[PDB]
Each structure stands twice: as structure tokens, then as C-alpha cells.
């Protein structure tokens, strides 16, 4: 596995993901993943400025697992620095009932 394309659209290899916020200024997705992976296998791993991140699992449990297990952890950046990143699901006007 490597993946490498110019385009790189907003694809969702999975549905069960975990929103990470409160990342360091040096924090990366690599280390982040290696961390988030705590759950299971990460098919998606991205990080943005400010201090946010995103990881997608192949299993639901993994999500909840890492969600709780991790639920706010001490992430170490590639610069040694650290920061408290929370692990929570993604919400946005749920359907509830069609």
C-alpha cells in the first residue's frame, strides 16, 4: 500500500471514522495514524492545520474502540512536541428517521 495521485478527491474508503482535534503545530498524519491505528487498520489518514485530523477504519468496533480507548490522548509530533487530541465520531444533522 502506498497510494499516490494528483487529483486525490474527497473519497471515503470507509464510513466509520474518527475526528481528531487539538493536534500540535508539528503534528503529522503519519505519527497520528500509527497512533490512531491503536484500534485496527487505518485506510484513511489526513491532517490539516490548526490542529485537526481524520482517520477511517475498516471495522466499526475499531472506531468506537479507538474513540473510547483513545478518547483524548497525548499525541507526540515529529518535533517531539505533544498535544491533547480528542477522539470523537462525525455528526451533522442526523437522519434519525426517513
UniProtKB/Swiss-Prot annotation:
Modifications made to the protein after synthesis: Extensively phosphorylated on serine residues in the RS domain.
Compartments, record wording: Nucleus
Disulphide-bonded residues: none
Stretches assigned to the RRM domain: 16-92
Domain of life: Eukaryota
Assembly and oligomerization: Interacts with KHDRBS3/SLM-2. Interacts with HABP4. Interacts with NOL3/ARC/NOP30, NSEP1/YB-1/YB1, SAFB/SAFB1, SRSF6/SFRS6, TRA2B/SFRS10 and C1QBP. Interacts with RBMY; the interaction inhibits SRSF9 pre-mRNA splicing. May also interact with DUSP11/PIR1.
Family, as annotated: Belongs to the splicing factor SR family.
Function: Plays a role in constitutive splicing and can modulate the selection of alternative splice sites. Represses the splicing of MAPT/Tau exon 10.
Protein name listed in UniProt: Serine/arginine-rich splicing factor 9
Annotated source species: Mus musculus (Mouse)
Originating gene: Srsf9
Residue window of the full protein shown: 104 to 188 of 222
